[PDB]
Design a binder for this molecule. Structure first.
Ligand SMILES: *C\C=C(C)/C=C/C=C(C)/C=C/C1=C(C)CCCC1(C)C
Ligand SMILES: CCCCCCCC/C=C\CCCCCCCC(=O)O
Ligand SMILES: CCCCCCCC/C=C\CCCCCCCC(=O)O
Ligand SMILES: CCCCCCCC/C=C\CCCCCCCC(=O)O
Ligand SMILES: CCCCCCCC/C=C\CCCCCCCC(=O)O
Ligand SMILES: CCCCCCCC/C=C\CCCCCCCC(=O)O
Ligand SMILES: [Cl-]
Ligand SMILES: [Cl-]
Length: 264
């Protein structure tokens, strides 16, 4: 039902699909390694944000590790090419952990927009249901990527709607509680806000791929777009939650953060 399964790829694409998935495991697990260590140095008010990116790294990490392992469990080499045997690839669990990863990835921002208590809990809840509506509508569209490109369009359309809606609430909180942030970080979160628009338009590109390269290296183009989105949605936004997170630790009195910024 997915467009991976339609294709007898050559050999070079597979190994490169094997290879996207593999450094993608490696890079998050290495990112993981690093949000753990500068945990000493966050004020215990943005500490959960850097800790939302140990969760995120081993979330994107398992799924991408599940997938590569499942990418290779899946295809022998037969009379030229790597062919579906009888154990299927499909990008379906990836939406599923975006059910967990999009959310978790938003509160750390919301934590670094210093949302707290009722307005942390209020903003957090609406971003999540908008994320979910986007995620499940999209999940059901790529369900017809072979069978029904028209609903893929239609369901993609609804999913987009929720995206628009959810960026509007992301940026509305930034571009408004911007000045409550400290450390000099009142600045870097509008900037961060545009990287996280770019990598989030990458998936709905990896999503219209079937209706414009219904072919084998269309499958590769699709997986090209995934790795990059995973790299700066999970990992590079996160590195910045910490830059934004450490600069607020430091500037409010956090002695370990003040001297963490000293030998840099
Ligand atoms: C891997 C980390 C993140 C934050 C990924 C998020 C996923 C999306 C933004 C995907 C969004 C969709 C949209 C915007 C509309 C078409 C359907 C999609 C599910 C691809
Ligand atoms: C095993 C397959 C390849 C995966 C291993 C990759 C080796 C590390 C490569 C870089 C990934 C990004 C690491 C995050 C940087 C943290 C340090 C920093 O802040 O600059
Ligand atoms: C892979 C790494 C094995 C150990 C993980 C790094 C230890 C972190 C030390 C610490 O912050 O307490
Ligand atoms: C929550 C989503 C609410 C309903 C949106 C449904 C719109 C598109 C339905 C497509 C199914 C179909 O094509 O028959
Ligand atoms: C900023 C995120 C970086 C993502 C890095 C992804 C690595 C891929 C980079 C370019 C690939 C170029 C190699 C050409 C592959 C040809 C495809 C094929 O075999 O048919
Ligand atoms: C060309 C390469 C593009 C670089 C990709 C970005 C990699 C990591 C970004 C570092 C995140 C820290 C934010 C900058 C902190 C600051 O404002 O000085
Ligand atoms: Cl504190
Ligand atoms: Cl993920």
């Amino acid at each position: 039902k997915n467009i991976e399964s339609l294709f007898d790829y050559s050999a070079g694409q597979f190994e490169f699909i094997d290879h996207l998935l593999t450094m993608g495991v490696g890079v998050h697990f290495a990112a993981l390694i690093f949000f753990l260590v500068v945990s000493q140095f966050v004020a215990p008010k943005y500490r959960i944000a850097t800790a939302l990116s140990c969760i995120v790294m081993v979330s994107a990490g398992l799924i991408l590790n599940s997938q590569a392992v499942m990418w290779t469990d899946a295809y022998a080499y037969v009379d030229g090419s790597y062919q579906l045997q009888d154990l299927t690839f499909s990008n379906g669990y990836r939406y599923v952990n975006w059910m967990a990863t999009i959310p978790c990835l938003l509160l750390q921002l919301l934590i670094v927009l210093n949302l707290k208590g009722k307005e942390l809990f209020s903003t957090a809840t609406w971003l999540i249901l908008a994320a979910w509506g986007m995620i499940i509508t999209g999940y059901v569209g790529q369900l017809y990527e072979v069978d029904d490109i028209a609903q893929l369009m239609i369901w993609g359309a609804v999913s987009t709607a929720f995206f628009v809606v959810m960026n509007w609430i992301v940026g509305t909180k930034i571009f408004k509680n911007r000045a409550t942030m400290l450390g000099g970080t009142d600045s870097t979160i509008t900037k961060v806000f545009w990287l996280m628009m770019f990598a989030w338009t990458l998936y709905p590109i990896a999503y219209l791929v079937p209706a414009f390269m219904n072919n084998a290296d269309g499958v590769v183009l699709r997986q090209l777009l995934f790795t990059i989105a995973d790299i700066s949605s999970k990992v590079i936004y996160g590195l910045m939650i910490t830059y934004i997170a450490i600069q607020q630790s430091a500037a409010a009195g956090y002695v370990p953060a003040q001297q963490a910024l000293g030998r840099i």
